[PDB]
Amino acid sequence: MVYSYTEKKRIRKDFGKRPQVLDVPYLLSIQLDSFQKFIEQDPEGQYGLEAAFRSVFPIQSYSGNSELQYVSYRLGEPVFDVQECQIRGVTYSAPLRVKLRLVIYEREAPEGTVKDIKEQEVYMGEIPLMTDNGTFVINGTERVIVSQLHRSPGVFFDSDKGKTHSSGKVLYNARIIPYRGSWLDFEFDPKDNLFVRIDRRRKLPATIILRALNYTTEQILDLFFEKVIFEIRDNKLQMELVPERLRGETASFDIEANGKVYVEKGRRITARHIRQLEKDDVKLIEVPVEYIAGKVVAKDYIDESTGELICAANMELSLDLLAKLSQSGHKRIETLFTNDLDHGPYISETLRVDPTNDRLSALVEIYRMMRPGEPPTREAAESLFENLFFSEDRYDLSAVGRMKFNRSLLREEIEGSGILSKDDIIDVMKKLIDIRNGKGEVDDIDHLGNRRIRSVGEMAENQFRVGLVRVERAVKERLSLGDLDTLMPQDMINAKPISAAVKEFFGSSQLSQFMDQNNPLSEITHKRRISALGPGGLTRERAGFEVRDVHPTHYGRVCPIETPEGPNIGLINSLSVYAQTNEYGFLETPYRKVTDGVVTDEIHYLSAIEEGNYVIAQANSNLDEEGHFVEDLVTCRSKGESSLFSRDQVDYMDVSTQQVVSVGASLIPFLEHDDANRALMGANMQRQAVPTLRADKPLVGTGMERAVAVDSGVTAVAKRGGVVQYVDASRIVIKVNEDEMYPGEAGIDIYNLTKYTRSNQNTCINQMPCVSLGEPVERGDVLADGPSTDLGELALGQNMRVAFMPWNGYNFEDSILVSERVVQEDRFTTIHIQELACVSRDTKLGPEEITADIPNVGEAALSKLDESGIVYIGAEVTGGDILVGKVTPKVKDSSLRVPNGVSGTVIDVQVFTRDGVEKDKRALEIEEMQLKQAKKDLSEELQILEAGLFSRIRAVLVAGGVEAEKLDKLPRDRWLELGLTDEEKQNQLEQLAEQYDELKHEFEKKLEAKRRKITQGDDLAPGVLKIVKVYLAVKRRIQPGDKMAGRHGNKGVISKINPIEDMPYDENGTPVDIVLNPLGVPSRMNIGQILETHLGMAAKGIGDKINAMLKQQQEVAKLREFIQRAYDLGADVRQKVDLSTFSDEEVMRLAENLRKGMPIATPVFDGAKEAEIKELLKLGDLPTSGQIRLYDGRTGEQFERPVTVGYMYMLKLNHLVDDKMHARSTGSYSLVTQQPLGGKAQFGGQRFGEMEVWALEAYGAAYTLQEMLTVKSDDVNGRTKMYKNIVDGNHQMEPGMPESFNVLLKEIRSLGINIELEDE
């Protein structure tokens, strides 16, 4: 057994029992391997930019009769890396270069070119790149593309009751949904006439398509219907009985011959009669003329002699018609079999709607129904009809759509073309008619086998296609008209349409979300959201219980708990922990192979429609350490049904008890106990915790923290193994070991940590070291904590000591009462960093300046600016302080002032300048910083190679060919001028001094390039001269009104900040830190929070025994004994750990991190039994009831009965109150109508909205209302007369008439509608 060097510092005591056979996949492979799938070229041309190019090129005009064609593409390295790009505020992007070859043919000749011109990689655009954290950077702002989930291409059959006609019956419908191009709907009319339409246009008679494909009705009838024949021999019109065509229906008429009668008139027909029908060989039989007089004919019948019609396919027969046509010599008359149950006549019925004659008349009807007002025309019509279904420019089932289609038509194969074909539509019709004949089933729409995930690497491939589609339309014309003589490919194309397409996508699409960089969980659970909304999806306002609800295939694929309750429940889901995207995009999830009777430890991923074909055991099911099930019969799910089945009947097993959830819920301990309301609100509140100041560890967790904090990319992780060379909380630098070094390198990995910086939500993000100088580290160890982490565990909140009890009502209803001790400790203080910016311009009156020489202001304000016109770093500032002394010509003091209300310390400034514009000493101050920071880190390589190279001189001197009359005092390349002879050592000296010079020249260009990065200005917007951004850090504390939450979806405002003496304290005199209310636990059934408290209490107790054993100077062998006795506690828990191997050093180093509570894991559905919590509390010296008697610090009286006390984990949420408290006396008003502005970002007035006005009207209160909506609001006179009457204290109003109502009058009178006020 082994633990990595960052595990072996706080080995979380694990209570899990099921052995985790599959370790959690890298939590963002959803995203990264999607974008990698876009960005890689791939000669198997599907997927990626290359697939899109090969979707358009080769490209040509017929009249140009020449082409240009895509050869290959290259993607250059990005002009600025992520860190610098995120400073400079551009987007992190890469230049796209494409080998286009233009080919010039000739007339008359064979096509052999007159010339062709490979343009040496024409520039095509700048595609953004994904950062390894899975995020794009789009205008310095960091953005995330959520995966979409939408209806896969294919064919889908559907039906409903009551939603249509409601006379008990149901109507059936088929759709073909291509990936790109037109939708085709087939549907029956109630009277089972069949109809078709494109793109939800008008309804058409369905055979209009078969007509359009030029089947005659005779052929259609041979495609759809079974034949029944009459042979006019042995007697007039004998009949071809196929026996099985009579079963269950009544023999209402005479059928007999030759010996035993099968079934006489009026009786059902059955098997024994059919067998007698077979044994008599009923190949022809006598039937009454009423039977033939029922028929509809199959085939066309002219009279050959007159040459003229008597009957036609699907025309209906009668005795006299039969007589004349058989009399005309047509001795075989042929018709259809149409039993109403099994063979309904729907296509013949459709031929009774049909207005068409044949192909052309249908194409006429198509073109007139689709493009009303354009002329139909034989040469023109096909340029509609073919581009509906048969042409690549406008119809495309991708490979997934073809697969799904073929699977539903039960085809043998799935390598198929993306267009339809005649037989491809006909098969849909046949399958739809089988459904109406009752012999088939409709698909469940909302099934994760019918909806597939699209992620970034596919949405961007489509938007890039829209680009190439608009270049198609330009380049075809330019090629067709062009001379082909001077044009080269970089004339043929230009980037602007591609760049528009892809930049608008990544910038502004409904799915290019601005990342919730709130804390490391919220980064991740956002990068793996599954969204039903957006382009090609549904809409949040326009769906109902059919899709919001969970479905049985969600299990293991989508988390049922973690969805953002509100107007879009379940239109957003979170992709479950273990789930994965299949090749095609369907969600698939891993299961264990059950081989005969033993659970084999191999995992097969199952998609949602493989799963229904097996029976799959629930993850809890026990096994015998050989791996046979222990239970003789076991719970499994099967076909959405679940029940018990035999041992060795079951065929797959779940991989882990965590498989059903997302990371967002998988982090709740004891989730096994909570109402799924309160699980949901928990798993939504964890992603809102703001990173507190001094974050640590949850004492009770699930062991998922060790993964969320690492995979979220925000802790800095050791890229290669080695030893810590230096640390200073800004840099960490690692001497990588030679077993993982690359041979020419210096061999030294710096990590410049990010310090105090705004998150996208204004919380700070300073990384801090966890290493010590000279400490060893191994690849993948956490070197530095992120925000909200410590030692690499996720740590949103603080393990506050809580007791559950009423307290004089301060924790009524939900509220949290808090002791002053928590605020004094800086437990929940949090740092909020704002960014304020002053732009400056080349305006129409002339160019602005930044200066201290501001007009109309004296040193009373300017004392905080430097001499340049920017605030000093470390200035502490408040409302109205001038941060940046901008001025405008013709001079106007427009300067950046700190907005009202806010306050903070100015932690940093940045300065950006156009080209050809002068700097200033705060630009030179920033240059001095950044230059020096680049140069230092470069020197720490050049120094290391210089030292190595002079050793490489010294050693091969000192070992042999010594010249050491004096040695180390000398400049170690002046060592060359010593008198060594022209034996090889002097030539080694000369060569290695040339290697030393070239080592200098190497950095002599590397530092020049770096300084050139810093020396330059930046790509400002048009009009601006320069911009400066100034950052205010605020250390906000905690106060009444702030919100805190547990993990269990318990939440409250904190209501009072009680002084320590008022907190309850125990029989040992320690006060409780928080007092939660009890009644929420039964009333909202989230009792898992109690077991977290008790297990938390035990967690404190073990640290309590350890801390005592470190204050007392216990020897390690006794201390190790107690720690070991803690890890081995419980049943056959999964984990094993041997402090015997920890070398004493690391036992003390471990104890020094347990000494405030042993951290515990309670994996989600696999937790501690109660009997193991008691066992831990008994190992501490604690009361196993979990409860303690408490006393009230207001009197020292005892409380009656003990109360729960223990260490809950509590999160401060980002809804803290000073960010919401607001009030307005008077200020701005809007221009169009004079009502007040609305906001906090503007000094706004609260909306006395519509419902409040009914509320006043429902008291008698008329004067209040009159005021509220005029004098206080709108009447431009009355409010200034009111204000003066109030300062005069007159308490009287003059109410007038609101100017918004006069706006209405003019806006009506701006129609030709004379509205007017009237007098009497």
Binding site: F545, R548, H551, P560, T563, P567, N620, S643, Q659, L671, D675, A676, F804, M805, G809, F812, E813, D814, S815, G1023, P1040, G1041, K1043, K1051, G1052, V1053, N1077, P1082, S1083, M1085, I1087, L1091, F1199, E1200, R1201, T1204, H1215, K1220, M1221, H1222, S1225, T1226, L1231, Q1235, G1245, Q1246, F1248, G1249, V1253, W1254, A1258, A1261, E1267, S1273, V1287, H1291, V1303, L1304, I1308, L1311
Partner: protein, 653 residues
């Protein structure tokens, strides 16, 4: 308007008029230059099709756009509907002198107060503050007083605490379904930043305290203060508008405390002695000499208001408990002690409070309600009424009840395994076997909770009502009655599929114990349905209330008595057998339509237009009356309104 740098905001109409005027410039040209019919029919079409845009863009074949297919908002799009003047700016509009904050509970408030932050009061009341600094002559005028407020000088608070000293401020949450959703309170100043609201009133707002923001408005004029104090002040609104039922209905912790205070425990310290009054009952409690729920006898006095309305005071021994003696001290002097002599719970105390309003009236009732609140909080504190997992009680018969029912389900299965029962019958009987198990588990668990308390009566054990923590909360009506505790420790029971059809194998577990993965996953088909319903419903409910006020708003009570003799007839609603509502629900407080006779003949009982107030409806309940004819607003023959008598009792008064 210009925006960020030298760019005009795309100001839609000016793009529409621009279309028109361009087209008109061309059409004047091509008319005077005398173009042929086909050309002028072109421009004339394009002009008509442009003025079409300017009036009501998008009633055309397609709305015209100037961006990524954003339709430009035309005039008629400015008038109508949810973003247009009538709803957006006329009917309700933003207002000055307002602010908002997170509310938080303030237990010490008297019912009429709320605390609001000094920062807000100072930024809200500014006009009134200047109206004192000039009146002190301490500031020269606005120009100085503005600065003197900005500097936040030491005087200003003593001025503020004179400005505000009794100026009602209006607090309302949003949405605000009903009149009780805006109320006025006298403010009291606070150091923090939250609005301290009164505990009992949070229920009216449906203000939970979990971070639920609330807006405040100052009324400016004298008339707005007189309306606020007379009508909207919380003391004037103890009743619902909708039904004769209090809205001050006690907060869960208050009723928990009063339940705990008034129980009897058959063994206690100081049990069985005899006392001369509540005051020495309290000395006995507070010194720790008697336990609060100990049995005792006390001398009591109580008061009754006679047939005239004047007090008769009476005195007796009473047999009771220490805590019922202490609680009697809070009741105003006119109620009978028989209302307190019982272990109180949420229904029992609501009627307590209601009877106070019945007998004394409003002004004592609001103070009595305040005292109840303070009392309940204080004894609920001493009670230490915690919750703890050792207090979840599982009846061990549960194990047998499953192990029995499982085989009987398998009997239905074995018949099915022999074809001996139909595919419908197998299912619809199995789910009834699970129901028969579930009722038994629930019944055994409620018996076990009551069973957990038994104690020595100085010799031999005897049982009493269980002090088990979760059972106090159920049996008191604080929170979480039968349907919750059943799930916490009984069984979770049957669950339903998405299409409502029932699961063949229930959740026989409960949240004290673990759900396995499947039981949990099926559990979410419940809860996610219930959340989808909430988020989906909250639209249609609002569109319903809109349609209603916007049809009802034309009515006002406008005559005293329209003079009808017509009306409609009220009976208990008798259906499905028994009566689902009695007559005293329907008829109370309407006026009689016609003379109401004695059951029988010729004896009249109520004159023909008398309000049937409570003493009349109790009288009808003394009689064998079944049907009563009353006036109803549908029959009131007032034109353009309703007469008062036809409407009858005002429920809030």
């Amino acid at each position: 308007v210009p925006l960020d740098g030298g760019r005009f905001a795309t100001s839609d109409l000016n793009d529409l008029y621009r279309r028109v005027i361009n087209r008109n410039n061309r059409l004047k040209r091509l008319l005077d230059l005398a173009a042929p019919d086909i050309i002028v029919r072109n421009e004339k079409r394009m002009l008509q099709e442009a003025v079409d845009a300017l009036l009501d863009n998008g009633r055309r074949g397609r709305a015209i756009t100037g961006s990524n297919k954003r339709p430009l908002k035309s005039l008629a799009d400015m008038i109508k509907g949810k973003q247009g003047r009538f709803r957006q700016n006329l009917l309700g509009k933003r207002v000055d002198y307002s602010g908002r904050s997170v509310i938080t509970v303030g237990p010490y408030l008297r019912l009429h107060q709320c605390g609001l932050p000094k920062k807000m009061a100072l930024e809200l009341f500014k006009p009134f503050i200047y109206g004192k600094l000039e009146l002190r002559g301490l500031a020269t005028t606005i120009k100085a007083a503005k600065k003197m407020v900005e500097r936040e000088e030491a005087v200003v608070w003593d001025i503020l605490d004179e400005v505000i000293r009794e100026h009602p401020v209006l607090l309302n949450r949003a949405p605000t379904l009903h009149r009780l959703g805006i109320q006025a309170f006298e403010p009291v100043l606070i150091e923090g930043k939250a609005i301290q609201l009164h505990p009992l009133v949070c229920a009216a707002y449906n203000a939970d305290f979990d971070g639920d923001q609330m807006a405040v408005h100052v009324p400016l004029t004298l008339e707005a203060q007189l309306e606020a104090r007379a009508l909207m002040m919380s003391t004037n609104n103890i009743l619902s508008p909708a039904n004769g039922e209090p809205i001050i209905v006690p907060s869960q912790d208050v009723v928990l405390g009063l339940y705990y205070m008034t129980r009897d425990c058959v063994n206690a310290k100081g049990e069985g002695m005899v006392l001369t009054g509540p005051k020495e009952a309290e000395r006995l409690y507070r010194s720790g000499l008697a336990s609060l729920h100990a049995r005792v006898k006390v001398r009591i006095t109580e008061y009754e208001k006679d047939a005239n309305g004047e007090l008769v005071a009476k005195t007796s021994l009473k047999d009771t408990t220490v805590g019922r003696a202490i609680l009697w001290m809070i009741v105003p002097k006119g109620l009978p002690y028989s209302i307190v002599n019982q272990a109180l719970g949420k229904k029992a105390i609501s009627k307590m409070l209601n009877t106070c309003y019945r007998i004394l009236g409003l002004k004592p009732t609001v103070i009595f309600a305040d005292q109840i609140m303070y009392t309940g909080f204080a004894y609920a504190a001493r009670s230490g009424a915690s919750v703890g997992i050792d207090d979840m009680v599982i009846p061990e018969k549960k194990h047998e009840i499953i192990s029995e029912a499982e085989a009987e389900v398998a009997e239905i299965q074995e018949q099915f395994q022999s074809g001996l029962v139909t595919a419908g019958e197998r299912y619809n009987k199995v789910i009834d076997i699970w129901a028969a198990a579930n009722d038994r588990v629930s019944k055994a668990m409620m018996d076990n909770l009551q069973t957990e308390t038994v104690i020595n009566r100085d010799g031999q054990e005897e049982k009493q009502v269980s002090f088990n923590s979760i059972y106090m909360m159920a049996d008191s009506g604080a929170r979480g009655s039968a349907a919750q505790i059943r799930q916490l420790a009984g069984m979770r029971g049957l669950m339903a599929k998405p299409d409502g059809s029932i699961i063949e194998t229930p959740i026989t577990a409960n949240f004290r114990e673990g759900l396995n993965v499947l039981q949990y996953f099926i559990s979410t088909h419940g809860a996610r349905k219930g959340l989808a319903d909430t988020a989906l419903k909250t639209a249609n409910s609002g569109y319903l209330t809109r349609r209603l006020v916007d049809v009802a708003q034309d009515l006002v009570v406008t005559e005293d008595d329209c003079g009808t003799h017509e009306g409609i007839m009220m009976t208990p609603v008798i259906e499905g057998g028994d009566v689902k509502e009695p007559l005293r629900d329907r008829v109370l407080g309407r006026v009689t339509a016609e003379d109401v006779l004695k059951p029988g003949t010729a004896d009249i009982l109520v004159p023909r237009n008398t309000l049937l107030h409570e003493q009349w409806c109790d009288l009808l309940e003394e009689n064998s009356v079944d049907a009563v004819k009353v006036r109803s607003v549908v029959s009131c023959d007032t034109d353009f309104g309703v007469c008062a008598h036809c409407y009858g009792r005002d429920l809030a008064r």
